[PDB]
Every structure is written in C-alpha cells, then in structure tokens.
Design an enzyme around this catalytic site. Structure first.
Site, PDB file in Angstrom:
ATOM      1  N   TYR A 124      36.150  -6.249   7.488  1.00 18.54           N
ATOM      2  CA  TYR A 124      37.217  -6.323   8.492  1.00 18.54           C
ATOM      3  C   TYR A 124      36.663  -6.747   9.847  1.00 18.54           C
ATOM      4  CZ  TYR A 124      41.727  -4.880  10.537  1.00 18.54           C
ATOM      5  OH  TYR A 124      42.943  -4.856  11.161  1.00 18.54           O
ATOM      6  N   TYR A 147      47.080  -8.842   9.232  1.00 20.10           N
ATOM      7  CA  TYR A 147      47.831 -10.107   9.210  1.00 20.10           C
ATOM      8  C   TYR A 147      49.270  -9.955   9.704  1.00 20.10           C
ATOM      9  CZ  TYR A 147      44.078 -12.315   6.435  1.00 20.10           C
ATOM     10  OH  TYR A 147      42.891 -12.809   5.976  1.00 20.10           O
ATOM     11  N   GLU A 199      37.725 -13.530   4.372  1.00 20.78           N
ATOM     12  CA  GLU A 199      38.327 -13.822   3.065  1.00 20.78           C
ATOM     13  C   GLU A 199      37.436 -14.694   2.200  1.00 20.78           C
ATOM     14  OE1 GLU A 199      40.597 -11.927   2.198  1.00 20.78           O
ATOM     15  OE2 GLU A 199      42.103 -11.670   3.773  1.00 20.78           O
ATOM     16  N   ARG A 254      34.868 -12.423   0.785  1.00 21.94           N
ATOM     17  CA  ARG A 254      35.472 -11.615  -0.284  1.00 21.94           C
ATOM     18  C   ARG A 254      35.720 -12.387  -1.584  1.00 21.94           C
ATOM     19  NH1 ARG A 254      39.510  -9.812   4.231  1.00 21.94           N
ATOM     20  NH2 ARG A 254      38.407  -7.985   5.092  1.00 21.94           N
TER      21      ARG A 254
HETATM   22  N1  LIG Z   1      37.092  -0.996  10.632  1.00 22.79           N
HETATM   23  C1  LIG Z   1      38.396  -1.137  10.432  1.00 22.79           C
HETATM   24  N2  LIG Z   1      38.891  -1.248   9.182  1.00 22.79           N
HETATM   25  C2  LIG Z   1      40.219  -1.387   8.959  1.00 22.79           C
HETATM   26  N3  LIG Z   1      40.689  -1.488   7.697  1.00 22.79           N
HETATM   27  C3  LIG Z   1      42.008  -1.641   7.434  1.00 22.79           C
HETATM   28  C4  LIG Z   1      42.493  -1.721   6.121  1.00 22.79           C
HETATM   29  O1  LIG Z   1      43.624  -2.152   5.884  1.00 22.79           O
HETATM   30  N4  LIG Z   1      41.699  -1.178   5.180  1.00 22.79           N
HETATM   31  C5  LIG Z   1      42.088  -1.113   3.752  1.00 22.79           C
HETATM   32  C6  LIG Z   1      41.107  -1.935   2.886  1.00 22.79           C
HETATM   33  C7  LIG Z   1      41.231  -3.439   3.206  1.00 22.79           C
HETATM   34  C8  LIG Z   1      42.141  -4.243   2.498  1.00 22.79           C
HETATM   35  C9  LIG Z   1      42.250  -5.609   2.793  1.00 22.79           C
HETATM   36  C10 LIG Z   1      41.441  -6.170   3.790  1.00 22.79           C
HETATM   37  C11 LIG Z   1      40.532  -5.381   4.504  1.00 22.79           C
HETATM   38  C12 LIG Z   1      40.427  -4.014   4.204  1.00 22.79           C
HETATM   39  C13 LIG Z   1      42.194   0.375   3.318  1.00 22.79           C
HETATM   40  O2  LIG Z   1      42.144   1.243   4.222  1.00 22.79           O
HETATM   41  O3  LIG Z   1      42.382   0.623   2.108  1.00 22.79           O
HETATM   42  C14 LIG Z   1      42.916  -1.673   8.500  1.00 22.79           C
HETATM   43  N5  LIG Z   1      42.433  -1.567   9.814  1.00 22.79           N
HETATM   44  C15 LIG Z   1      41.116  -1.427  10.040  1.00 22.79           C
HETATM   45  C16 LIG Z   1      40.628  -1.310  11.344  1.00 22.79           C
HETATM   46  O4  LIG Z   1      41.372  -1.330  12.323  1.00 22.79           O
HETATM   47  N6  LIG Z   1      39.252  -1.167  11.543  1.00 22.79           N
END
Ligand SMILES: Nc1nc2nc(C(=O)N[C@@H](Cc3ccccc3)C(=O)O)cnc2c(=O)[nH]1
Ligand SMILES: Nc1nc2nc(C(=O)N[C@@H](Cc3ccccc3)C(=O)O)cnc2c(=O)[nH]1
EC number: 3.2.2.22
Length: 259
Positions: free
Chosen positions: A76, A119, A173, A176
């Site tokens: 992220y 997004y 992406e 990933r």
């Molecule tokens: N460090 C940091 N991390 C974050 N991760 C997310 C998030 O949606 N994390 C998903 C896993 C995920 C899915 C797709 C793409 C990226 C990550 C989850 O919790 O399951 C949102 N926001 C953040 C943020 O603000 N900071």
C-alpha cells in the site's frame, strides 16, 4: 533506514521497468512464505517497525523526483515526499497512523491528508474512475511532475488524485500481479497510453479475496469460485490456485499455512 528502489520514466524501457518491479518485489517479500508457488507478504502481526516500509524513488525526464512509501505487508502506498514536504493518506487505523510517524522524519513539512488512499476515495476526488484514467510511461512521467508541484499550488486536487491512481497501479498493482506488470510492459514497449481494461480492474478489485481464497483453499481448491473478467469484459470463474500462478506475483498475509 528503509530500503530505496529507484525508477525513472526518462527513457524507460520494458527491461528497465521489469528490473524495477523485480527489485520492488524483492524488497517487499523475504522469501519466508511461499504457497502454491506464490510468495506471501510479511505478516503485520509482530512485524518490527524498522522492517515495515520500502521507499520507491521516482524520477522523470523533467528532472524531478518524488519518493513513495510502501507498506511491506500489503504494498500500500501510504504517502510521498517531494523535496521539503511529505504527505500521507488518512490512516485506516491507529497502528498505521503510528507507523507513518517513522517515515520521512527529517522532512520540514509533514501533512496528513483528510482523505484515505483507497481507489474509491481517489476516484471521487479525481472525478474519474480507473477505467477512464490512462496508464503508461507518459501518464507516470506526468504523475511524478504533478506530485512534485502539489505543495506549491501547481497541482489541483483532481490531478493529484489521478496521479496517485496512476502511481499505485503502475507500481503496487504491477508488483502484486505479473499480469498487470505485463500490461504495463506492453504500454511501455509501444509507448502507448491506455486506460486499464476490465481484466486489470477486476484483478485489482479481487486481490484481497484471491489472497484469502488461495490461503484458505483445500490443497489449492477454492471452496467458492471467484469471478474475474477477460479483456473484453466477459466473465470467467477461478476455481483453483493453479490458474493464478502466472497471474499473481504476491499475496497479502491472510492466515497461517496449514501443516
Ligand atoms: N498501511 C496502510 N494500509 C492500508 N491498507 C488498506 C487495506 O485496504 N488493506 C486491506 C488489504 C489490501 C487489499 C487491497 C490492496 C491493498 C491492501 C485489508 O485491510 O484487508 C487500507 N488502508 C491502508 C492504509 O491507510 N495504510
Ligand atoms: N494508496 C493506495 N491505495 C490502494 N487502494 C487499493 C484499492 O482501493 N483496492 C480495491 C489498492 N491498492 C492501493 C495501494 O497500493 N495504495
């Protein structure tokens, strides 16, 4: 402290981009966790702060540089530095809020955006969906400039949001998904900018679910099929990890591997 990977859009080629994405993946994953031939990112639980981030320094033909910070647990993009200013997305939780205090510590001006970095929020601010935002070396070149000039008032918020959307897809992406990396390689090879097709969009939207389905699978077999889309928008079902081995390059940690 945190590892830095450098990439420039200036004279970028398929090979230089490929080297970059490989280097990013190498700094994101430790090699400790590989399941059905697919690497898993470090578990957030108990991960020391000194190992939490990597830095992606992006330069362009305009001789400008920005540095993105990526969370190793999920790739992220948490924020960026341009010169004397750093900007962070509104953190999703207290742990992620504490974590970003360890980034760009010697920068003169630190800001946290009032908006989160997903997004849906970024598309709202951009006034455009991912399906209508062109990707490629040109868009990335322009995105680097747009991020660079934000602090001095040169960049409107919709342009900034669009620029984040470009960076996230072309870096995170692509890291990933080998498939998305391939789609970006193609754009670079022919220097042709284009918005992502449904195959790209649905993969991005499904990364968390695919990660969970693979990790919770019975010997690779999904309990529930996952619907993805082809380039033409037609639906196909994923029933097994096997078909995803050439498509997904890394997974978010979702559970412990079974014995
Ligand atoms: N460090 C940091 N991390 C974050 N991760 C997310 C998030 O949606 N994390 C998903 C896993 C995920 C899915 C797709 C793409 C990226 C990550 C989850 O919790 O399951 C949102 N926001 C953040 C943020 O603000 N900071
Ligand atoms: N800032 C930032 N935002 C992201 N948002 C998404 C997203 O909304 N995925 C469905 C995925 N990945 C990212 C990422 O890597 N960085």
């Amino acid at each position: 402290q945190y590892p830095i990977i450098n990439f420039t859009t200036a004279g970028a080629t398929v090979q230089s981009y490929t080297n970059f994405i490989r280097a990013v993946r190498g700094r994101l994953t430790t090699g400790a966790d590989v399941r059905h031939e697919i690497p898993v990112l470090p578990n957030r639980v108990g991960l020391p702060i000194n190992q939490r981030f990597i830095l992606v320094e992006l330069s362009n033909h305009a001789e400008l540089s920005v540095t993105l910070a990526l969370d190793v647990t999920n790739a992220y993009v948490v924020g960026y530095r341009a010169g004397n200013s750093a900007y962070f997305f509104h953190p999703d939780n207290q742990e992620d809020a504490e974590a970003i205090t360890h980034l760009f510590t010697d920068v003169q001006n630190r800001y946290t955006f009032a908006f989160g970095g997903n997004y849906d929020r970024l598309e709202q601010l951009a006034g455009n969906l991912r399906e209508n935002i062109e990707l490629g070396n040109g868009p990335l070149e322009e995105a680097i400039s747009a991020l660079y000039y934000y602090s001095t008032g040169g960049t409107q918020l919709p342009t900034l949001a669009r620029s984040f959307i470009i960076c996230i897809q072309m870096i995170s992406e692509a890291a990933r998904f080998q498939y998305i990396e391939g789609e970006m390689r193609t754009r670079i090879r022919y220097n042709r900018r284009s918005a992502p097709d449904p195959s790209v969009i649905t993969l991005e939207n499904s990364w968390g679910r695919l990660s969970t389905a693979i990790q919770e699978s019975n010997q690779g077999a999904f309990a529930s099929p996952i619907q993805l889309q082809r380039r033409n928008g037609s639906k196909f079902s994923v029933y097994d990890v096997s078909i995803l081995i050439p498509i997904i390059a890394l997974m978010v940690y979702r559970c412990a591997p079974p014995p």
